[PDB]
Subunit: 106 residues, 3 copies
């Protein structure tokens, strides 16, 4: 998928998690987010398309999705145990990682 | 290890999972599969030896193993919970990631 | 963080795990080790400074931290279900991964 499609997936499912009632809804949304994070790692963002593909900034961009995926998995661990409120709070804290990348490459 | 050696490991241990009768067999097979997938990330496939190491195709190839590893971990979660049948069903779904990479790059 | 700071975070928190008494101490040390491992993926070791960031040595180096992060997570899985001693044993086994990278790129 496109980078923008994957960002829409991440943004939409974060809102699904915010409004969720039960753990299975949160689990499903976090799974879509993880798939979107890994697919986005394949993209070249507009900010960097004029730099070398081997540039340190492209590596910095890709590793950011490794960090996002691992943090999503931590929230998913809480959702699998049925801890809805804790999973929702951990999902909310993802936004620190979203924003950290946006400050550099948005 | 060799790219083909890592593929033999993935394939041998998928066959173990297909036939397994308990969660211990599955969990040990998935652990080997994850190690082979991560090690395969370090290789250049023959069909991409004519690409730069950070070309979009080589990124697609390497991230394909991150996707495989996360999907293996999903199956391993299920096996650690005694969901042997569900873990085996997750192993079957894994094959679409195997196939998609082979279609592009084998 | 720079690579040296990430390495001190790995070293320090491995020492906490060896000395820990309960699962909360082990879980929190493993979480910091994982964050440091992923942040280290973004760095260039001094022996590879003059190489392309996408050279095979640099890919080998970055995948080394994928393997370490996944091995850290296995230890966290053991600690999260309260198997403290098995988590401590697993954390001790990580050193073979630390040492393997060191022998090549330190
Ligand atoms: C880098 C490692 C990023 C992480 C982590 C996240 N995002 Fe992102 N985002 C990134 C870039 C380079 C861009 C610009 C390219 C583009 O798609 O526009 C974006 C953009 C968005 C957008 C707008 C998408 C669009 O319709 O154009 C959204 C809504 C967005 N990003 C949301 C988002 C969320 C919720 C994240 C964390 C869960 C997140 N992003 C992480 C780079 C990176
Ligand atoms: C890319 C991201 C791949 C994924 C995911 C999987 N495989 Fe693979 N495989 C890939 C390539 C580029 C090649 C060709 C290597 C070569 O030197 O020709 C292969 C090959 C195989 C083989 C045949 C090995 C041989 O001796 O020629 C097998 C049996 C195989 N792959 C199995 C396999 C399985 C079971 C996978 C998922 C569980 C899987 N592969 C994923 C690239 C990629
Ligand atoms: C590569 C994939 C590595 C893995 C895995 C681990 N380390 Fe590492 N380490 C690496 C390099 C290239 C270096 C040299 C850094 C430099 O700038 O010179 C290091 C260094 C250390 C150090 C010493 C730090 C210093 O004195 O500046 C320590 C204490 C250390 N590393 C610890 C450590 C541990 C405990 C690891 C596994 C849990 C580990 N490292 C993994 C590369 C890699
Ligand atoms: Cl997950
Ligand atoms: Cl990577
Ligand atoms: Cl696993
Ligand atoms: Cl890369
Ligand atoms: Cl972890
Ligand atoms: Co897990």
């Amino acid at each position: 998928a496109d980078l923008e499609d994957n960002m829409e997936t991440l943004n939409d499912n974060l809102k699904v998690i915010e409004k969720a009632d039960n753990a299975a809804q949160v689990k499903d949304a976090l799974k879509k987010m993880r798939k979107a994070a890994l697919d986005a790692k394949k993209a070249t963002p507009p900010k960097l398309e004029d730099k070398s593909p081997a540039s340190p900034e492209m590596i910095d961009f890709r590793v950011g999705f490794d960090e996002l995926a691992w943090e999503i998995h931590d929230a998913a661990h809480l959702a699998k145990e049925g801890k809805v409120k804790e999973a929702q709070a951990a999902a909310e804290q993802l936004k620190t990682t979203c924003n950290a990348c946006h400050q550099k490459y948005r």
